[PDB]
Curated annotation (Swiss-Prot):
It is found in: Cytoplasm; Cell membrane. InterPro entries: CA_dom (IPR001148), CA_dom_sf (IPR036398), Carbonic_anhydrase_a-class (IPR023561), Carbonic_anhydrase_a-class_CS (IPR018338). This is Carbonic anhydrase 2. The active site is at H61. The keyword Cell inner membrane does not apply. Zinc. Can also use cobalt(II) with lower efficiency, but not copper(II), nickel(II) and manganese(II). PROSITE patterns: ALPHA_CA_1, ALPHA_CA_2. It comes from Homo sapiens (Human). Changing T195 to A/C/H/P: Strongly reduced activity. The gene is CA2. Changing E114Q: Strongly reduced activity and sulfonamide affinity.
Length: 257
């Protein structure tokens, strides 16, 4: 029922999910002059060497790649986190034009897209329990700007025509998510929420400072996906981003000066 259109988009979500007007909603604008450098923050530890991707699917809101999270194969540790978080899936948010598409903004600047790598805290046993806890999820957010092609993204781009419409999925094994990371792991972090329904306030956000570059031809392929199912009127899957929400009583911390 919810989506990103005029009649079911983010301005309507509160009617079904009242937490939309909550105290720790995401995304937010990162004001770089107001963020606080925190020397107590540790470097991120990203251990994706043993990642096992399974499937790629169009869920009607985005496309996502899912991973085997039945063991500690691909994990995120360190940074602002206590304990071990397992990689579950990644997905993107993007725009109709190159000047919009990211969810987070930096000094009000929007990027062409935003990549979310979603991880859940293993102390809670399964992702469903984790979403009910204030430290249940950690999402690594990476900005995409348009420039040179990202070789590590091309395998994803090449299969999108096979999942054009809602509900379509395909086998997507042996994909290495390390190919999507920037060089630097410097980051901002703040406590927030899922950016789609159910909008649960269960996420430690880790947003990387360094964007990755993708080519115009790569992003164009994202824009050819459909929100609709096969045999419904065609509606292009674009602008699947939630606008920035009020920071309220939160401080954004930076790992770097
Ligand atoms: C379409 C629903 N997506 C929801 C529910 C679960 C799928 S999830 O994996 O906990 C997750 S992560 C994000 S985001 N955009 O904050 O990273 C949204 C979602
Ligand atoms: Zn997302």
């Amino acid at each position: 029922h919810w989506g990103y259109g005029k009649h079911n988009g983010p301005e309507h979500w509160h009617k079904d999910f009242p937490i939309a007007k909550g105290e720790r909603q995401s995304p937010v604008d990162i004001d770089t002059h107001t963020a606080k450098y925190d020397p107590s923050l540790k470097p991120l530890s990203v251990s994706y060497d043993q990642a096992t991707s399974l499937r790629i699917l169009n869920n009607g809101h985005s496309f996502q790649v899912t991973f085997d999270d039945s063991q500690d194969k691909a994990v995120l540790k360190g940074g602002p986190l206590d304990g071990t978080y397992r990689l579950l899936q990644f997905h993107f948010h993007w725009g109709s034009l190159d000047g919009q598409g990211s969810e987070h903004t930096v000094d009000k600047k929007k990027y062409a897209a935003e990549l979310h790598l979603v991880h859940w805290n293993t102390k809670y046993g399964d992702v469903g329990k984790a979403v009910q806890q204030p430290d249940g999820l950690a999402v690594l957010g990476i900005f995409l700007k348009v420039g040179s092609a990202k070789p590590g993204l091309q395998k994803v781009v090449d299969v999108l025509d096979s999942i054009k419409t809602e509900g379509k999925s395909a086998d997507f094994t042996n994909f290495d998510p390390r190919g999507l990371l920037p060089e630097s792991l410097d980051y901002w972090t703040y406590p927030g929420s899922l950016t789609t329904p159910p909008l649960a306030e269960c996420v430690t956000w880790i947003v990387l400072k360094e964007p990755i570059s993708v080519s115009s031809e790569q992003v164009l392929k994202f824009r050819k996906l459909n929100f609709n199912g096969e045999g419904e009127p065609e509606e292009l899957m674009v602008d699947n981003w939630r606008p920035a929400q009020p920071l309220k009583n939160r401080q954004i911390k930076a790992s770097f000066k």
